[PDB]
Amino acid sequence: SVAILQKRDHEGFGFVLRGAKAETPIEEFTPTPAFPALQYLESVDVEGVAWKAGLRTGDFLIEVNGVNVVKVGHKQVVGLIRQGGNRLVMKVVSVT
Amino acid sequence: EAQTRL
Ligand SMILES: [Cl-]
Numbered sequence: 001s002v003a004i005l006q007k008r009d010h011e012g013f014g015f016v017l018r019g020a021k022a023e024t025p026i027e028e029f030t031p032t033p034a035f036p037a038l039q040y041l042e043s044v045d046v047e048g049v050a051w052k053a054g055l056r057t058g059d060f061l062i063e064v065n066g067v068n069v070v071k072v073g074h075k076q077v078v079g080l081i082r083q084g085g086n087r088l089v090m091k092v093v094s095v096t
Numbered sequence: 097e098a099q100t101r102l
Contacts, residue, residue, distance in 0.1 A: 074098040
């Protein structure tokens with residue numbers, strides 16, 4: 001699914017991203033339906049922007065703003081998220 | 097792993 005997030009300057013998107021650090025051997029990772037990406041949503045604030053856009057805990061991040069991040073390390077994915085400022089589009093797959 | 101709030 002694709003979530004479209006557009007927030008106010010002073011607020012957050014309302015989620016916590018967790019996933020593999022670039023310093024680990026991320027080059028050895030092979031995506032599978034049971035673990036489809038390196039980064040995923042640890043939590044989503046209820047009635048936050050991400051929640052209202054349909055994101056939920058356990059969603060694995062496939063794309064950020066059209067860029068595939070399945071095999072991308074944490075800091076680089078965070079950089080792509082922050083690059084859009086108040087606007088963010090994320091393609092995810094739900095583990096649930 | 098790292099964790100970042102956004
Ligand atoms: Cl990292």
